[PDB]
Amino acid sequence: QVRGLEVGMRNANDAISIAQIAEGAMQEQTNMLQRMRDLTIQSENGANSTADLV
Amino acid sequence: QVRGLEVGMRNANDAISIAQIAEGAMQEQTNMLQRMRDLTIQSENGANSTADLV
């Protein structure tokens, strides 16, 4: 039990790190998606032109 | 919402400018139309001649 738990402790510290990395990457995807929302709102002017939308 | 409104604010400032330019141009069309009214009234003298009306 004593040695079994010690390996089990390191087993869970590994799972924490995996969840930590995935969470960090999704934060950057959220910021870029917010910028796409602004461009879609900005792309709705009636003073733009065909070349401006491109 | 915060970033959405900020783009929306600039979206409406653009509409104000378009309405501002169109309004300015119609003012000058109004002044020239008034001068045409005076010429039509002036063109109704019985002391004019065929060459004067031209």
One-letter amino acid of A51: A
This entry's atomic model was obtained through: cryo-EM
Chain B closest-CA separation from residue A42 CA (Å): 6
User: Is B11–A37 a contact, with Cβ atoms under 8 angstroms apart?
Assistant: no
Indicate the residue of B3, B15, B18 with minimum beta-carbon distance to A38: B3
The single-letter code of the amino acid at B14 is D
Q: Which of B11, B17, B18 sits opposite A41 (nearest CB)?
A: B11
C-alpha span between B47 and B54 (Å, rounded):
14
Instruction: Give the Cα separation of B39 and B49 in Å (integer).
Output: 15
Give me the torsion for CA of B23, B27, B28, B29, rounded to 10°: 90
